[PDB]
Amino acid sequence: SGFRKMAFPSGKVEGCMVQVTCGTTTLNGLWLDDVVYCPRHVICTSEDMLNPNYEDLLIRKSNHNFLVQAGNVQLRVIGHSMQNCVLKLKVDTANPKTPKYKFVRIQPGQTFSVLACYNGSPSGVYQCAMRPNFTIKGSFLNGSCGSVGFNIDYDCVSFCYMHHMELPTGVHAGTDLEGNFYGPFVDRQTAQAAGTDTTITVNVLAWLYAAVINGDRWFLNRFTTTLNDFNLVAMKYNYEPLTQDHVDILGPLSAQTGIAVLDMCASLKELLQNGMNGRTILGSALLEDEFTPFDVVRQCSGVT
Amino acid sequence: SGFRKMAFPSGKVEGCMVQVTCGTTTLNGLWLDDVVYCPRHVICTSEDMLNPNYEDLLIRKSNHNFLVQAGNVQLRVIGHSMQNCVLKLKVDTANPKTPKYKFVRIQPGQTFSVLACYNGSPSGVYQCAMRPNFTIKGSFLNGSCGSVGFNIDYDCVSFCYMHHMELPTGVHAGTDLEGNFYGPFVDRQTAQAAGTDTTITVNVLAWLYAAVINGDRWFLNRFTTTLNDFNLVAMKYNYEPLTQDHVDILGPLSAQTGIAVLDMCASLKELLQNGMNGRTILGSALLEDEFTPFDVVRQCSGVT
Numbered sequence: 001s002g003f004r005k006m007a008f009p010s011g012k013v014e015g016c017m018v019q020v021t022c023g024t025t026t027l028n029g030l031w032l033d034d035v036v037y038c039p040r041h042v043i044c045t046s047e048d049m050l051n052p053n054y055e056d057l058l059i060r061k062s063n064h065n066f067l068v069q070a071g072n073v074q075l076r077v078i079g080h081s082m083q084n085c086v087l088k089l090k091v092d093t094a095n096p097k098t099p100k101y102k103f104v105r106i107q108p109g110q111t112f113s114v115l116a117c118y119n120g121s122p123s124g125v126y127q128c129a130m131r132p133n134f135t136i137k138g139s140f141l142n143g144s145c146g147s148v149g150f151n152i153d154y155d156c157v158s159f160c161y162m163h164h165m166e167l168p169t170g171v172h173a174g175t176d177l178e179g180n181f182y183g184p185f186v187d188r189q190t191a192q193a194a195g196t197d198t199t200i201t202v203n204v205l206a207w208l209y210a211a212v213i214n215g216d217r218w219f220l221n222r223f224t225t226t227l228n229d230f231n232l233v234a235m236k237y238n239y240e241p242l243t244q245d246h247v248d249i250l251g252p253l254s255a256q257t258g259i260a261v262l263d264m265c266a267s268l269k270e271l272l273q274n275g276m277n278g279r280t281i282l283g284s285a286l287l288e289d290e291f292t293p294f295d296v297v298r299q300c301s302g303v304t
Numbered sequence: 305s306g307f308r309k310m311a312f313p314s315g316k317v318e319g320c321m322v323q324v325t326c327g328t329t330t331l332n333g334l335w336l337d338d339v340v341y342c343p344r345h346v347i348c349t350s351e352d353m354l355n356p357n358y359e360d361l362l363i364r365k366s367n368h369n370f371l372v373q374a375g376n377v378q379l380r381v382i383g384h385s386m387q388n389c390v391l392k393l394k395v396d397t398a399n400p401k402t403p404k405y406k407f408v409r410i411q412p413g414q415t416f417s418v419l420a421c422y423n424g425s426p427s428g429v430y431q432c433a434m435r436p437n438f439t440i441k442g443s444f445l446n447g448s449c450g451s452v453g454f455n456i457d458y459d460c461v462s463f464c465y466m467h468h469m470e471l472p473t474g475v476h477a478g479t480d481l482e483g484n485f486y487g488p489f490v491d492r493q494t495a496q497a498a499g500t501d502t503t504i505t506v507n508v509l510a511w512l513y514a515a516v517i518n519g520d521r522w523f524l525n526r527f528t529t530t531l532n533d534f535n536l537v538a539m540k541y542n543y544e545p546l547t548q549d550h551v552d553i554l555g556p557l558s559a560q561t562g563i564a565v566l567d568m569c570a571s572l573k574e575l576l577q578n579g580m581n582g583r584t585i586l587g588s589a590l591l592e593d594e595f596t597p598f599d600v601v602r603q604c605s606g607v608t
């Protein structure tokens with residue numbers, strides 16, 4: 001028992017982290033096979049970041065200008081190319097620590113672990129969710145660019161995120177591993193509207209099932225609701241509309257606890273309408289949405 | 305910016321995790337040099353756990369009865385000994401992945417990362433605090449025994465905890481790496497009083513400094529207090545008494561924000577007396593105490 005914001009063990013990703021220096025800019029890179037992936041803004045200086053002409057800046061750079069350090073040893077850059085907002089530096093040595101990996105584009109509402117790095121060295125690991133507005137409320141300082149988000153299924157690491165930028169609002173933005181930004185963001189130091197965010201209803205409900213599994217049952221009530229009545233409450237409280245697919249993904253948690261999904265919905269409805277009343281659920285005084293139904297079953301079953 | 309419950313990157317600890325099977329019991333072990341450390345209850349069966357005679361149970365066991373698997377390869381056990389509540393299985397092969405390490409006894413209120421493992425395989429990593437009553441509110445299922453808690457200073461891993469038991473209350477108990485239980489607990493399946501817990505005042509104050517650093521300032525007020533007046537409030541709200549040493553450990557955060565420690569104390573006093581009023585601080589609707597002053601400066605500076 002016990003329920004925590006658990007991240008995947010970062011070991012397989014730590015072995016892929018390198019330092020990438022171009023000119024006076026240093027950030028992190030992801031060494032997989034004979035390719036180091038890093039944010040393309042490594043080629044910029046502070047003067048460039050207002051509106052960088054990346055194609056032009058990259059043309060002034062050659063293979064020898066990209067310094068790649070993997071711990072204390074230097075990697076030999078034999079090629080370079082830009083793909084969307086990432087640079088792919090081809091190196092003459094495949095990473096011996098390359099795990100089985102995949103490049104995935106995650107959906108908003110899904111979670112992943114972040115391995116925050118500085119100068120190609122890992123500082124820490126935390127679990128977070130891709131917000132419905134495609135931002136991440138991470139913990140990132142200057143030089144954290146190039147840190148990646150991932151999920152691990154057995155021995156296969158699915159890289160989903162690469163860190164590029166902190167918006168003036170303090171929230172974070174980045175790309176998939178093909179360099180495509182999540183959300184409407186661009187890699188320019190400019191005011192960028194993040195868009196209206198919502199709470200991930202399915203994840204809150206999944207977390208409500210984890211609370212019942214782990215002992216917390218005070219919020220359970222004698223009521224039920226319909227998807228329609230629930231969605232009217234979800235609308236008023238800026239919660240994502242709940243669909244039959246969300247009810248289906250909650251099937252296992254519903255079967256384990258014997259609490260019908262619409263019965264759990266009615267409990268969430270009462271919590272939205274009345275608050276916690278000074279009470280807690282799994283050590284939180286607010287409704288948590290950073291745990292997916294899969295994360296709950298994984299943590300409550302013990303998959304390694 | 306951004307503030308998260310960040311755990312240390314678990315890589316160096318993952319490389320030390322092995323599976324230890326004795327009879328019909330399987331749990332995790334920590335392979336450092338030519339020694340595998342595991343909870344001594346590996347020698348028990350369900351029938352034994354009510355009141356095990358560990359000296360007697362161990363006498364029926366020989367080196368060949370302790371099966372130690374490091375991934376897919378078997379380790380050869382050449383010696384065995386009990387030290388407090390841990391078994392030390394001497395093996396004929398030093399772990400090639402042994403990092404620079406230390407065995408430390410942590411103080412209550414300090415934090416550490418936990419690498420939850422099952423069958424010698426890591427499932428996840430989370431950050432937690434040693435409660436003032438020496439329990440840990442972890443996330444542990446059956447077979448998680450042998451999972452360790454640690455801190456990492458550069459390349460040196462300081463092992464502080466080993467998991468042994470979940471109390472009937474759902475909280476966790478374990479030992480230092482010399483097998484000494486933290487708190488009054490014994491490795492017997494019996495009702496065990498955990499003792500009165502308190503909130504880690506210094507850590508709450510440290511977290512209040514992290515909130516100001518990361519943008520959250522609504523709780524700052526026009527008041528100040530004394531250690532005496534604050535301690536009267538801390539008493540009423542089951543908070544640890546604040547001492548001059550705690551004020552001294554908060555010196556750096558006070559210097560960075562320019563907010564005097566007693567001024568921050570007066571803000572915490574108002575939050576204790578009036579609650580959050582439906583507001584949040586760093587994404588939490590309650591007062592967080594799982595971040596030490598050192599954790600705050602580390603996360604807000606970027607140490608790797």
Ligand SMILES: CN(C)c1ccc(N(Cc2ccsc2)C(=O)Cc2cncc3ccccc23)cc1
Nearest residue numbers: 025044045046140141142164165166187188189
């Ligand atoms: C000097 N240098 C080239 C540089 C300089 C700044 C950045 N930018 C701006 C920007 C614009 C468009 S794309 C990035 C970042 O946003 C980098 C960054 C990320 N995360 C957390 C941060 C906290 C504090 C400062 C910077 C942070 C990238 C690069």
Ligand SMILES: CN(C)c1ccc(N(Cc2ccsc2)C(=O)Cc2cncc3ccccc23)cc1
Nearest residue numbers: 329348349350444445446468469470491492493
């Ligand atoms: C069968 N076997 C030998 C066994 C069987 C049970 C345990 N115990 C009891 C106990 C008594 C004294 S020392 C341990 C544990 O407490 C083990 C444990 C730990 N963490 C989370 C758990 C969740 C569910 C079930 C067990 C959990 C240890 C060993």
